[PDB]
RNA sequence: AGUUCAACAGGGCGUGAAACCGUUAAGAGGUAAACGGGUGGGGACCGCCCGCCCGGUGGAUUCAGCCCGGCGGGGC
RNA sequence: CCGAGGUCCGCGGCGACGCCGGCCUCCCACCCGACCCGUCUUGAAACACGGACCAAGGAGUCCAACGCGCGCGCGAGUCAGAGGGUGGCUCGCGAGCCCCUGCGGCGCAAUGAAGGUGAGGGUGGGAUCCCCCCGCCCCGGCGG
RNA sequence: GCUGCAAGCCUCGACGAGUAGGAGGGCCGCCGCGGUGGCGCCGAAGCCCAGGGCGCGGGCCCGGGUGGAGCCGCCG
């Protein structure tokens, strides 16, 4: 029953730094975006670039 | 589904005392703790018997309670039933019982505590014996009553020896036709 | 009639006995009634006895 | 039963008068609210007038049914006529204006007899309720700035013949509060029984046994809620109203001295009853903490097991490693060599 | 004093634990290549005898899993007795017998009611684990520790779970009080379904005795 | 004898409350006013009473002596604690510990004076 | 006024047990009334009749009885009544009765307001 | 009363407890002890032999108090005396014997069922069985009779 | 219009249920109507962070330990 | 931590009714199920009977005696039944209290048509209990 | 810490069809009585309700409307 903050984070192989994402949800849905890194949540830390999308 | 019989599931033994004696449900308080916890095969048949009812708590009569006393080997023990010790006008002498019974008849008082001996409730019994040490548990005759007498294959049946119900004991009173 | 084992009844209730059934109501006022008849006897024979 | 305390007589003020009366031994006899309840049943029910119905009730038609043929539902209907009522059923119970199912008749077993030693037994019982504070205040009486519970007042008491005299006594030994009690609940009965000479109903106040009557019964007799009682002649239907025990009794020094004698003690049989004395105790020590508690009982009884035993609930040990180590500890190790069997090791 | 007896007695438990713990591990670790000795042995015995020309016939299996396949209603009364005694009172359920002709002729007079085999290690190895549970005190009691078997047969030298293994793969001298202990396996329905139940398993149904096919039918029910 | 005195009042008392199906004893000397053998509080020789002042200031601690048994003008004690919280808690706190007077009552005491007291 | 614990009351069913055939008669009423008819369906528990209440129907124990609100309802008439829930209140509501007057409904939400104790119909007058 | 009764749970059951094919008819089998010889024999026959016939002489003006013999056994003889005579008469067993007059405490005949004491009596009876007088010799003692 | 606290007490008049009926409001209607289970829509009336301890902070403490004096109470 | 069954020491948009919530119940709609109850009957949805609708009424009672079970009092006794006594100018209270040299009933003796006569432990199983012996002990007990 | 209404509370396991019929429980319901605890012209009983709920159920509580003088809980 341990914390959020201690749980072990997963990652699909398919997702690695540098590959191209795709939302599908927000307001970004279907915008490909590039992958950077995983943060310590497991959420992933997304790029569009800006100047791009 | 499952392959039985829930015929036989109720187990029909009295837990409780059909009674509302507030004395009584006491001693059941007081000996349902020494069933639990003393671990003596005497407190868990007290814990029956207090239970049951009058009928199967039948008198001991005084003089049956003295031949049981007068076995080998009861010289200092003490008798317990758990019901009334009833007097015996037909016996003469009293050996200075130790009896410990739920209740004693006036005259049964009287020739127990004047024979210098000594009279116990079943509290006491709790309390200066809680294990049932050094105890000899009197019953009294539970097929002794006139209802037993009935209670057989049926009167007008060979070797039945069985009283039948009948308004009157007399000439004309079911005697003619079977009973010779 | 008879289901099993027990005694040959023989109630008495064949007749009209509804017509004839005499309730012991007043047996408490006729014990006021039979004690104030002695008392009023007791004065009228004031100095003998009550019991004759 | 040997716990007869010195109980002390008050004036006719709320303080004592110096003298001292040994407790009765009836307020010792075994308190039985079973008997009790059993006794004030058929003891109420020996008061109780007969009611029953008219044995004409319904049968003063004529009435012949009509039998099958006609439409109607085989009842016996009442003679033709230019009335409504001809043609109505007029006999069975489920007609208007017929007779009942069952008409109560007048005699019915209104009046139960009780054995004379239950009634003294459920009266010994009554008694020894009220000596005790419990008791009393569950009953429902306010006693709780009375001097003592067994109230026992002078005998000049008995000798009071006005109504100030008595109120003031009340006054003085607290006792007025169960008074107020009984104005407070002084109302309208709910039911059809105000229609049957039973509109107004009250509380039940304390109970004043005397020995003497001098004008005590008198005194007394305007306060609502009090019950005058001779000490002789103890109804145990105004001793345990409503088949309940702890009833209020203010007892005077004349009343509380021949007590004794009325019942007797264990020792000695009353003297004002042939052949009688208090019922014996089936259960000398009543206290079951001082028997549980004791030396030798504590001695006997194992100690008190207070683990919880919840269900363990069930894992798959073919699944879960560590459930299966526990039960097979061997199962590590053949693990162990079967994982290291899938790994390609070259030997000589 | 009465914490130092107290602490003394925790500690020898404590020490007495850790010596059964290391008895059951060399038990349980012996009891595994017994399993494979005797797999060896009909092995060099079969391989001997087609050396020499002949034949090596193995001995008769001495344990069978009967598996209750038929319902409850509509039985008849001679098959209803055995099936009780057999301590299968419910459908799809499992117990142990040890195969004996006062055995083998009750499961014949109670053939088209079950679905019976001779299992092997697998099978009797998964069904105590999966499905294991004893019966205490007449009550079904989840096989959690070795505390509960070595409680009830621990006169038998059965102290933990794998000598009840031991005992009713191999049968032994105390199969009769180990295989009562274990309630009635509750098995679940064949994952899979089955041929047809009504029939025998020679003739395309699945009543019956199927020698070693019993295992595929654990497999699937447990 | 209060095993034989609650044997007389656990279903029939003048305080006895039965409704939704939930039962409430209202005796002034219960801590809870729970029906049970341990919270009646007019059947023991030791019993604990807590109730507010007569302003709605304070905590009035009601105890009941030893002599004061069949007396009930002379039955109880009335001691009044209008302090702060901790030191009304501490007080009624060392009257059930320190005097070893009816213990099992100790923290339902700390509570119904916890409770009065807001 | 929170209760001291508010668990997920779950309910096996919310619909009424509707007593059969009252929907076709105005003589029976909707209280249920068990089917003892030779023939009946509802009593056969036939297929899409209306089922009958059994035991297996039962509440959880830990919240029979409990209101929405995670309280259970206790009826009051005064407040000497009220004082009752002074110990308590975290778990059980005060519900003042039907027949008191405005005057008297009036000092009890004021009284249950200082113990602490939730009304479930403080202002019904 | 009629709180307990089991017609208060008979309520909403038709039959009653009486039976939907047999209902609960006016006397399915005849009112009072009908049929005692023709369908109810097995009955009468099983539970009360002896029902149907003549047996012995008939008294027509048979008078309870002529054949009044009310008995009592030795066991009980001493019951008639208080505890203290009995015991008082036992130091002195040198011929100084009380006198239990049977007939005055209700009884006419002495039957010899249970044992005496070792202690001479006179007991006065109207009527002695042979075995309760040999009790009564034997014991040391006689057997006075009385009219 | 008026009397009455009230005509939701107007003369077979206290309360005024059900069946039945008029009207209004709302919705529906080719498988007689109703009914069980599941859900959907609609409608009518409703419904809706604190406690303990501790750390500092800044204002008030008929202010605390302890002592003294008086009183009360407690025990296998 | 693959360990005596769950926690987050993770979080988002809306929160004063406009755009939030109301299981069930009201209306409506759809899918699945679904023949009218009662009654007798082997078998009822029956082309078997009763029932157009609604309200109110409407059917296991009381008495006597018996049986068995249970509660209670006392106990080889038990019940006081008719009656009597009396808190005395009698409410509640036609209750309750009290004693009847306890009449009598039913028990304490049966058996015979009657005249009549009239009742002295053993073995086996057995709750419980008693004693002895050997270990252990937390001195109270536990084990054999 | 909580309970200990011991007729209470807690733990574990298995089980659950039913006419005729039997038994048990009922803080199901109705009328009156002895007790006890109340309620009511600031509005009882009864009646009505597309309001809020409780109980497996019998039924119950609350709110609103109407009504106008009595009524209910608990132990027997
Ligand atoms: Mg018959
Ligand atoms: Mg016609
Ligand atoms: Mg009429
Ligand atoms: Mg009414
Ligand atoms: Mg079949
Ligand atoms: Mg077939
Ligand atoms: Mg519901
Ligand atoms: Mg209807
Ligand atoms: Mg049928
Ligand atoms: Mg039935
Ligand atoms: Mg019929
Ligand atoms: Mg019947
Ligand atoms: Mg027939
Ligand atoms: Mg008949
Ligand atoms: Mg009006
Ligand atoms: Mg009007
Ligand atoms: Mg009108
Ligand atoms: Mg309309
Ligand atoms: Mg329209
Ligand atoms: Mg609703
Ligand atoms: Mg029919
Ligand atoms: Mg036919
Ligand atoms: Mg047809
Ligand atoms: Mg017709
Ligand atoms: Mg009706
Ligand atoms: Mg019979
Ligand atoms: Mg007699
Ligand atoms: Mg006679
Ligand atoms: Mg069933
Ligand atoms: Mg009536
Ligand atoms: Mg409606």
Redesign the pocket.
């Known amino acids: 029953?341990?914390?959020?903050?201690?749980?072990?984070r997963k990652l699909r192989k398919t997702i690695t730094p540098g590959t191209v994402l795709i939302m599908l949800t927000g307001r970004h849905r279907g915008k490909r975006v590039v992958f950077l890194k995983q943060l310590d949540?497991g959420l992933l830390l997304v790029t569009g670039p800006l100047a791009i999308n | 589904?499952?392959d039985?019989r829930?015929n036989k599931?109720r187990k029909v033994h009295?837990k409780?005392?059909?009674?509302?004696?507030?004395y009584?449900?006491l001693l059941?308080?007081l000996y349902?703790?020494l069933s639990?916890r003393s671990?003596?095969?005497?407190?868990?048949?007290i814990l029956?018997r207090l239970?049951?009812?009058?009928?199967?708590?039948?008198?001991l009569?005084?003089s049956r309670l003295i031949?049981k006393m007068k076995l080998p080997?009861?010289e200092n023990?003490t008798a317990?039933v758990v019901?009334?010790?009833?007097?015996?006008?037909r016996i003469q002498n009293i050996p200075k019982l130790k009896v410990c019974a739920l209740?004693?008849?006036?005259?049964?008082?009287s020739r127990i505590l004047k024979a210098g001996g000594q009279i116990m409730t079943f509290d006491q019994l709790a309390l200066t014996?809680?294990?049932?040490?050094?105890?000899?548990?009197?019953?009294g005759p539970r097929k002794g009553?006139?209802?037993?007498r009935?209670?057989g294959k049926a009167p007008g049946t060979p070797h039945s020896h069985t009283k039948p119900?009948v308004?009157?004991?007399?000439?004309k009173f079911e005697?003619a036709r079977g009973?010779? | 009639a008879p289901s099993?084992?027990?005694?040959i009844?023989?109630?008495?209730?064949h007749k009209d006995w509804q017509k004839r059934?005499r309730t012991?109501?007043?047996?408490?006022?006729?014990?006021?009634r039979?004690?104030?008849?002695?008392?009023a006897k007791a004065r009228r024979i004031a100095p003998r006895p009550?019991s004759g | 039963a040997c716990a007869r305390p010195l109980i002390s007589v008050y004036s006719e003020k709320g303080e004592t008068s110096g003298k001292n009366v040994v407790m009765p031994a009836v307020f010792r006899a075994?308190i039985?609210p079973?008997?009790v309840?059993?006794?004030?049943?058929?003891?109420?029910?020996?008061?109780?007038?007969?009611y029953a119905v008219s044995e004409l009730a319904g049968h003063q038609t004529s009435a012949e049914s009509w039998g099958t043929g006609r439409?109607v539902?085989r009842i016996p209907r009442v003679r033709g006529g230019g009335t409504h009522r001809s043609g109505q059923?007029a006999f069975?119970?489920?007609?208007?204006g017929?007779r009942?199912?069952?008409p109560?008749?007048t005699?019915?077993?209104?009046?139960?007899?009780?054995?004379?030693?239950?009634?003294?037994?459920?009266?010994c019982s009554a008694l020894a309720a009220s000596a005790l504070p419990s008791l009393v205040m569950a009953?429902?009486?306010?006693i709780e700035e009375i001097p003592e519970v067994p109230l026992v007042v002078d005998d000049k008491v008995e000798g009071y013949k006005k109504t100030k005299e008595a109120v003031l006594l009340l006054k003085k030994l607290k006792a007025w509060n169960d008074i107020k009690?009984?104005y407070?609940?002084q109302?309208?009965?709910?039911?059809?029984?105000?229609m049957?000479n039973?509109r107004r109903?009250?509380?039940?106040?304390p109970c004043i046994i005397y020995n003497e009557?001098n004008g005590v019964?008198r005194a007394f007799?305007n306060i609502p809620?009090?019950?005058?009682?001779?000490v002789?002649?103890?109804?145990?239907?105004?001793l345990?109203?409503?088949?309940?025990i702890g009833?209020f009794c203010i007892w005077t020094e004349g009343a509380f001295r021949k007590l004794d004698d009325?019942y007797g003690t264990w020792r000695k049989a009353?003297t004002?009853?042939?052949?009688?004395n208090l019922?014996?105790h089936?259960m000398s020590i009543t206290d079951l903490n001082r028997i549980i508690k004791?030396?030798?009982v504590?001695?006997?009884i194992?100690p008190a097991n207070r683990?919880?035993?919840?269900?363990?609930?069930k894992?798959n040990p073919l699944?879960?490693?560590?459930?299966?180590?526990?039960l097979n500890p061997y199962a590590k190790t053949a693990?162990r060599r079967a994982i290291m069997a899938h790994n390609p090791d070259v030997k000589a | 004093?009465?914490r130092?007896?107290?602490l003394?007695?925790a500690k020898a438990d404590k020490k007495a634990s850790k010596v059964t713990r290391k008895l059951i591990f060399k038990r349980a670790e012996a009891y595994h290549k017994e399993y494979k000795q005797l797999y060896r042995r009909e092995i060099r015995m079969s391989r001997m005898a087609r050396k020499a020309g002949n034949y090596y016939v193995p001995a008769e299996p001495k344990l069978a899993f009967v598996i209750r396949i038929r319902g409850i209603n509509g039985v008849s009364p001679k098959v209803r007795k055995v099936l009780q005694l057999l301590r299968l009172?419910?459908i799809f359920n499992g117990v142990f017998v040890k195969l004996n002709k006062a055995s083998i002729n009750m499961l014949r007079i109670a053939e088209p009611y079950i679905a019976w085999g001779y299992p092997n290690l697998k099978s009797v190895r998964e069904l105590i684990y999966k499905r294991g549970?004893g019966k205490?005190k007449?009550?079904?009691?989840?096989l959690?520790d070795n505390s509960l078997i070595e409680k009830t047969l621990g006169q038998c030298g059965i102290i933990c779970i794998e000598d009840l293994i031991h005992e009713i793969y191999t049968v032994g001298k105390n199969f009769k009080a180990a295989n009562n202990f274990l309630?009635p396996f509750?098995l679940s329905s064949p994952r899979g379904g089955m041929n047809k139940k009504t029939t025998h398993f020679v003739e395309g149904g699945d009543a019956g005795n199927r020698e070693d096919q019993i295992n595929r039918l654990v497999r699937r029910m447990n | 004898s209060p095993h034989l005195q609650?044997?007389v009042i656990?279903?029939?008392?003048?305080?006895?409350?039965?409704?939704?199906?939930?039962?409430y004893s209202?005796e002034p000397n219960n801590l809870?006013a729970?029906?049970?053998?341990?919270?009646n509080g007019l059947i023991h020789?030791?019993t604990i009473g807590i109730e507010p002042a007569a302003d709605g200031k304070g905590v009035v601690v009601v105890?009941?002596?030893?002599?004061?048994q069949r007396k009930p003008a002379?039955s109880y004690?009335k001691?009044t604690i209008n302090?702060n919280?901790?030191?009304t808690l501490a007080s009624v706190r060392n009257?059930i510990r320190?005097?070893?007077?009816r213990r099992?009552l100790?923290?339902?005491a700390?509570?119904r004076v916890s409770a009065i007291l807001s | 006024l929170?209760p001291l614990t508010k668990p997920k009351?779950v309910?096996?069913?919310?619909?009424?047990?509707?007593?059969?055939?009252s929907?076709?008669?105005?003589?029976?009423?909707?209280?249920?009334?068990?089917?003892?008819?030779?023939?009946?369906?509802?009593?056969?528990?036939?297929?899409?009749?209306?089922?009958?209440?059994?035991?297996?129907?039962?509440?959880?124990?830990k919240?029979?009885?409990?209101?929405?609100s995670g309280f259970k309802?206790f009826?009051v008439?005064?407040?000497?009544?009220l004082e009752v829930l002074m110990?308590?209140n975290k778990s059980h509501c005060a519900?003042?009765?039907?027949?008191?007057?405005?005057?008297?409904?009036?000092l009890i939400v004021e009284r249950a307001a200082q113990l602490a104790i939730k009304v479930?119909?403080p202002?019904?007058? | 009363?009629?709180?307990?009764?089991?017609?208060?749970?008979?309520?909403g059951?038709?039959?009653?407890?009486?039976?939907?094919?047999?209902?609960?008819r006016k006397h399915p089998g005849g009112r009072g002890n009908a049929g005692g010889l023709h369908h109810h024999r097995i009955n009468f026959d099983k539970y009360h032999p002896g029902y149907f016939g003549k047996?012995?002489?008939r008294?027509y003006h048979l008078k309870?108090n002529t054949?009044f013999?009310?008995?009592?056994?030795?066991?009980?003889l001493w019951?008639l005396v208080s505890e203290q005579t009995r015991v008082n008469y036992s130091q002195k067993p040198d011929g100084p014997a009380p006198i239990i007059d049977v007939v005055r405490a209700?009884y006419?005949?002495?039957?010899?069922?249970?044992?005496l004491p070792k202690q001479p009596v006179i007991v006065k009876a109207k009527?002695?069985?042979?075995?309760?007088?040999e009790?009564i010799k034997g014991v040391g003692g006689a057997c006075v009779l009385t009219a």
């Open positions: 029953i341990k914390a959020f903050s201690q749980h072990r949540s | 589904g499952v039985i829930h599931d009295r409780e005392p059909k009674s509302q004696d507030i009584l449900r059941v308080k349902r703790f639990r671990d003596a095969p005497f407190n868990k048949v029956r239970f049951m009812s009058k009928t199967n708590r039948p008198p009569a005084l031949r080997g009861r023990l317990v019901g009334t010790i009833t007097d015996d006008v209740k004693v008849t006036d005259r049964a008082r014996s809680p294990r049932g040490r050094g105890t000899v548990l009197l019953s009553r006139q209802v037993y009935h209670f119900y308004r009157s004991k007399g000439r005697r009973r010779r | 099993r084992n027990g005694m009844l023989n109630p008495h209730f059934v012991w109501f007043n047996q408490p006022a006729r014990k006021i039979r004690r104030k008849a002695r008392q009550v | 075994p039985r079973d008997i309840n059993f006794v004030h049943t058929n003891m109420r029910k020996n008061k109780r007038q007969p439409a539902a059923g069975g119970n489920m007609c208007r017929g009942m199912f069952a109560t008749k005699w019915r077993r209104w009046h139960r007899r009780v054995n004379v030693n239950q009634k003294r037994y459920a009266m009953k429902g009486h306010r009690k009984v407070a609940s109302r309208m009965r709910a039911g059809k029984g105000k049957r039973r109903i009250q509380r039940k106040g009557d019964t007799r809620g009090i019950t005058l009682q001779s002789s002649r103890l109804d145990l239907l105004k345990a109203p409503g088949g309940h009833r009325l009353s004002l009853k042939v052949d009688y019922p014996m089936k004791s030396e030798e504590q001695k006997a194992r683990k919880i035993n919840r269900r363990v609930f894992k699944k879960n490693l560590r459930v299966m180590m526990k693990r | 004093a009465i130092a007896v107290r003394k007695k009172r419910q549970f205490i007449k009550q079904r009691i989840a959690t309630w509750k | 609650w044997m656990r279903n029939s008392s003048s305080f006895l409350i039965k409704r939704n199906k939930q039962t209202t809870k729970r029906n049970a053998f341990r919270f020789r030791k105890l009941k002596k030893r002599s004061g002379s004690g001691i302090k919280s901790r030191a009257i320190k005097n070893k007077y099992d100790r923290m339902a700390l509570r | 929170r009351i309910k096996k069913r919310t619909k009424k047990f509707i007593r059969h055939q929907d076709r008669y105005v003589k029976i009423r909707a209280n249920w009334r068990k089917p003892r008819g030779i023939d009946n369906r509802v009593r056969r528990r036939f297929k899409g009749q209306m089922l009958m209440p059994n035991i297996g129907y039962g509440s959880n124990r919240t029979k009885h409990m209101l929405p309802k009826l008439h005064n407040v000497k009544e110990m308590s519900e003042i009765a039907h027949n008191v007057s405005s005057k008297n409904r009036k479930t119909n202002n019904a007058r | 009363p009629t709180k307990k009764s089991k017609t208060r749970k008979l309520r059951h038709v039959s009653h407890g009486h039976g939907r094919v047999g209902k609960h047996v012995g002489m008294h309870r054949t013999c009310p008995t009592i056994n030795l066991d009980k019951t209700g006419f005949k002495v039957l010899g069922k249970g044992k009527f002695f069985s042979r075995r309760a007088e009790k």
